[PDB]
Structure 1
Amino acid sequence: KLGKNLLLTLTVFGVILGAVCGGLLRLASPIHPDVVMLIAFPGDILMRMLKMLILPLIISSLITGLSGLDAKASGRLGTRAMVYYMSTTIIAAVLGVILVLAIHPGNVSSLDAFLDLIRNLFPENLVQACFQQIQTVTKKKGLEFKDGMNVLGLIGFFIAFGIAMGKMGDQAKLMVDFFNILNEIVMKLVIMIMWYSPLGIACLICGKIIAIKDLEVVARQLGMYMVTVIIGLIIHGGIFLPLIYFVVTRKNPFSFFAGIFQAWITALGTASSAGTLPVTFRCLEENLGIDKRVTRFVLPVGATINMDGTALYEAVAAIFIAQMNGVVLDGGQIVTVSLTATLASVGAASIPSAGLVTMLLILTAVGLPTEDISLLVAVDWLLDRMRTSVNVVGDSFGAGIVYHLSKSELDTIDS
């Protein structure tokens, strides 16, 4: 383990170097602010270089993922799996938003805000939604343009685009190959910047540690943040999933919880939703007698497009950062956070600590200071390893639920 996972070693060296350089330069002096910005400048280069690559990334991944990979699944298993997967993620995101508003760390009318949301959902002109959002000002009222991206309009129009390409069928094969080429090129350009990343994260940690003005209250609210995400994760993966199992299936949930309770240990141990599939296959198809005809369809897709924990942690860590810089949020933006939590949970998957890459979608959707993500990155070496456990549990309970809903269908397709 000395030379393997070279990027992990480099990020550890970067965080350690940035922490000790902060510990030197904070005890150095009251610093001139422009040399502080000059020191934090590689972090700003990393943030601007990564926000460069969410416009072709959304556009390419939405049309590669939707049309071309929904192509003729099982007629009932596909829609049941998709209903469960877009149900539990939305429920987890609403639970995360409710918890981070209730605990409250980090210490126009509402009807016009929700009309503002519905107006921003359907964009007027397309190129005037790649960089400008419509908002409502006072005097009567009028509607003008604030800066910042409009993520909801693009995701709405391109979801309608991908679905309308799926129903054309075999005629459109000069387009899905084009967008697969575009997605592969954009992903290689993301790999380049993620190889550059640790020198950016070191300077950003230094820039957020030197100019922080207090070394205690930030640690207090960070501990409060970790308390919030732990309590949200345990209330979801303890109450909300076995209740959904018990309402529909009318079976005892702990008897299902036994085999996943032995798989859950290595799920915590390896922190990957992709690493635990050879374990959970031997767990699920043997310890509970689940049919082979449904697990090969509902588990490997469930390890990718269904991660409740990376919705909970993401939608809590957005409104934490909003409640650090004083920017209170209204109902025209809480729905944006709770929807792009769903639309940013399904993207970045199958890897340890992928919540610190797909956060940059939400941190530009709601219109927030993007350059404060480093106060997350020091406290995620303990947080991801239990988040992946709920990512595993949310796939296993769906593998139970779809199988109990379609046992009759499997038996009538037998004979």
Structure 2
Amino acid sequence: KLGKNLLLTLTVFGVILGAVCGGLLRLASPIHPDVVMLIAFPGDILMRMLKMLILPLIISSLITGLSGLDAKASGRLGTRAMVYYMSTTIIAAVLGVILVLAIHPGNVSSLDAFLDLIRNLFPENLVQACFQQIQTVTKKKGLEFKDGMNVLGLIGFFIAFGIAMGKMGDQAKLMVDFFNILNEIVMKLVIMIMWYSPLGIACLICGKIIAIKDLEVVARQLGMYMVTVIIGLIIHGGIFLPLIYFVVTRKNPFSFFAGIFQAWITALGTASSAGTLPVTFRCLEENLGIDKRVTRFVLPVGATINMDGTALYEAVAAIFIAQMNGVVLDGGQIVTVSLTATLASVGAASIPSAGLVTMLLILTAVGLPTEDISLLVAVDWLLDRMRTSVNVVGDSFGAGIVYHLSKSELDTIDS
């Protein structure tokens, strides 16, 4: 089993080795800060090599994805599924933000903050939006350029670019081939750095354990963080998905959980939504009467773009790092977390071995220190096995809803 899947085992071996060296090394002496920096330096190299690639990955991924959208994708079954997928993810991210602001683990006006958000959606310059944001200083008011990448402005402009390119049709074939080649190259580059990763994670954990100044104060917030993620998953799935199934289809949603039970158990087992497709197919289209014209489209795209557990997890785990460093997020960074968690949950599953670049996307979208991310990797393998469960349940309810909103059209195509 050690030779199969040689990335998660090296990651947990690096986490355990780094925790052992940090726990043995803080016992010795008050360590000098320069040798602390020399210990934590390969994790800094890892964070820089991953942050180097969030700009061409956004630029290539938006233009490759949004130009491959077919409006003839079985008619209204495409649009209904897309409206479901972009609604439940937003509800999940909003619930995650509320639950991390209310549980609170890890102990200018608001109008100017919201106007700075609206100004940052529409940047004056495109090359300056790659590394600078705008903000409202005050004494009269004035506008000043702070430093940090403007994620929302680039995402907005390249959404407009991909949508305008997809309407050109076959005239813009050369540009989508160019950006497809750029996307394949940057995905191979993301694959190599994640092979380097189990050395950087170990050094980051050792540097975070050595300089913690108290040990039972971080083991309490790392417990309350798992508690708020579990409360978020339980509330989101168990309440909001049968409720959104009841007000639309008006069928009894407990027989629906009686139907998809084996898919949920297998998603808890294999901890991956992509490998759980032949179980949920045999569950849905053999136990719940869903038509094969619905599942064969809804499920293989929901296993790629419908990640509503990852949205709640990444909307909790960014404000948790904001609360550990004492930062208070204003009204303009809460909306940035809630939008970037939605855009990054779709990207965490569509890009292979990119689960660490999505967290760095949010942590540099709101301008946070990214070196506290090593305390999240030490508990991620206790949480992805339950993230996959909420993802699979959100897929199954979507395949149950899109069939009920499309009974009549399938009946007329049948007759």
> Shorter-chain-normalised TM-score: which range?
over 0.9
Separation (CA, whole Å) in 1 of partners of 2:7 and 2:250: 47
CA deviation map 1:268-305 (0-9, x unaligned) = 01110101001101111111121111111110000100
CA, structure 1 residues 262+191, in 2 after alignment: closer, same or farther (shift >3 Å)? same
Gaps of 5+ in 2: none
Separation (CA, whole Å) in 1 of partners of 2:42 and 2:356: 17
Separation (CA, whole Å) in 1 of partners of 2:11 and 2:39: 18
Deviation at residue 414 of structure 1 after TM alignment? 1.7
Separation (CA, whole Å) in 1 of partners of 2:57 and 2:321: 24
SS in 2 for 1:367: coil
Deviation at residue 28 of structure 1 after TM alignment? 0.9
Gaps of 5+ in 1: none
Native 8 Å contact 1:116 1:134 kept in 2:
yes
CA, structure 1 residues 187+353, in 2 after alignment: closer, same or farther (shift >3 Å)? closer
Native 8 Å contact 2:262 2:279 kept in 1:
no
SS in 2 for 1:286: helix
Match of 2:117 in 1: 117
Native 8 Å contact 1:131 1:148 kept in 2:
yes
Separation (CA, whole Å) in 2 of partners of 1:354 and 1:227: 25
CA deviation map 1:144-192 (0-9, x unaligned) = 1000000000000001111111111111110111111000000001111
Separation (CA, whole Å) in 1 of partners of 2:71 and 2:39: 50
Deviation at residue 9 of structure 1 after TM alignment? 2.2
Deviation at residue 81 of structure 1 after TM alignment? 0.6
Worse-matched range after superposition: 290-299 or 43-52: 290-299
Once superposed, what is the RMSD of the aligned Cα atoms?
1.3
Deviation at residue 353 of structure 1 after TM alignment? 8.9
CA, structure 1 residues 352+12, in 2 after alignment: closer, same or farther (shift >3 Å)? farther
Match of 1:321 in 2: 321
1:265-414 matches, cutoff 5 A: 265-349=265-349, 355-414=355-414
Deviation at residue 71 of structure 1 after TM alignment? 5.8
Match of 1:197 in 2: 197
Deviation at residue 256 of structure 1 after TM alignment? 1.1
SS in 1 for 2:280: helix
Separation (CA, whole Å) in 2 of partners of 1:7 and 1:340: 27
CA deviation map 1:105-126 (0-9, x unaligned) = 1111101110110000011111
Separation (CA, whole Å) in 2 of partners of 1:226 and 1:272: 20
CA, structure 1 residues 96+395, in 2 after alignment: closer, same or farther (shift >3 Å)? same
Native 8 Å contact 1:39 1:207 kept in 2:
yes
CA deviation map 1:360-407 (0-9, x unaligned) = 110100000011101001111111101100000001000000000001
CA, structure 1 residues 351+387, in 2 after alignment: closer, same or farther (shift >3 Å)? farther
Native 8 Å contact 2:130 2:154 kept in 1:
yes
What TM-score do the two structures reach when normalised by structure 1? 0.98
Separation (CA, whole Å) in 2 of partners of 1:11 and 1:96: 27
Separation (CA, whole Å) in 1 of partners of 2:163 and 2:358: 23
Separation (CA, whole Å) in 2 of partners of 1:352 and 1:43: 21
Native 8 Å contact 2:18 2:205 kept in 1:
yes
Worse-matched range after superposition: 131-140 or 349-358: 349-358
Worse-matched range after superposition: 144-153 or 289-298: 289-298
CA, structure 1 residues 349+192, in 2 after alignment: closer, same or farther (shift >3 Å)? same
Native 8 Å contact 2:273 2:392 kept in 1:
yes
- % identical aligned pairs: 100
Native 8 Å contact 1:305 1:347 kept in 2:
yes
Deviation at residue 249 of structure 1 after TM alignment? 0.5
CA, structure 1 residues 175+72, in 2 after alignment: closer, same or farther (shift >3 Å)? farther
CA, structure 1 residues 348+341, in 2 after alignment: closer, same or farther (shift >3 Å)? same
Separation (CA, whole Å) in 2 of partners of 1:85 and 1:266: 22
SS in 2 for 1:146: strand
Separation (CA, whole Å) in 1 of partners of 2:117 and 2:266: 42
Separation (CA, whole Å) in 1 of partners of 2:134 and 2:116: 7
Separation (CA, whole Å) in 1 of partners of 2:72 and 2:134: 39
Deviation at residue 316 of structure 1 after TM alignment? 0.1
Native 8 Å contact 1:271 1:352 kept in 2:
no
Deviation at residue 357 of structure 1 after TM alignment? 3.6
CA, structure 1 residues 406+264, in 2 after alignment: closer, same or farther (shift >3 Å)? same
Deviation at residue 354 of structure 1 after TM alignment? 5.9
Native 8 Å contact 1:68 1:176 kept in 2:
no
Native 8 Å contact 2:42 2:204 kept in 1:
yes
Worse-matched range after superposition: 79-88 or 3-12: 3-12
1:83-122 matches, cutoff 5 A: 83-122=83-122
Separation (CA, whole Å) in 2 of partners of 1:388 and 1:286: 22
SS in 1 for 2:146: strand
Deviation at residue 259 of structure 1 after TM alignment? 1.9
Native 8 Å contact 1:274 1:350 kept in 2:
no
Native 8 Å contact 1:310 1:355 kept in 2:
no
Tell me how many residue pairs correspond in the alignment: 415
SS in 1 for 2:294: helix
Native 8 Å contact 1:136 1:143 kept in 2:
yes
Separation (CA, whole Å) in 2 of partners of 1:353 and 1:231: 27
Ranges of 4+ aligned residues in structure 1 off by more than 4 Å? 350-355
What TM-score do the two structures reach when normalised by structure 2? 0.98
Native 8 Å contact 2:135 2:143 kept in 1:
yes
Deviation at residue 6 of structure 1 after TM alignment? 1.4
CA, structure 1 residues 359+164, in 2 after alignment: closer, same or farther (shift >3 Å)? same
Native 8 Å contact 2:71 2:78 kept in 1:
no
CA deviation map 1:195-236 (0-9, x unaligned) = 111111110110111001111010011101110000010000
Native 8 Å contact 1:46 1:200 kept in 2:
yes
1:143-292 matches, cutoff 5 A: 143-292=143-292
Deviation at residue 348 of structure 1 after TM alignment? 1.3
Deviation at residue 10 of structure 1 after TM alignment? 1.6
Native 8 Å contact 2:305 2:350 kept in 1:
no
Deviation at residue 355 of structure 1 after TM alignment? 4.4
Separation (CA, whole Å) in 2 of partners of 1:5 and 1:157: 38
CA, structure 1 residues 281+37, in 2 after alignment: closer, same or farther (shift >3 Å)? same
CA, structure 1 residues 353+103, in 2 after alignment: closer, same or farther (shift >3 Å)? farther
Native 8 Å contact 2:133 2:146 kept in 1:
yes
Separation (CA, whole Å) in 2 of partners of 1:53 and 1:286: 44
Separation (CA, whole Å) in 2 of partners of 1:256 and 1:20: 46
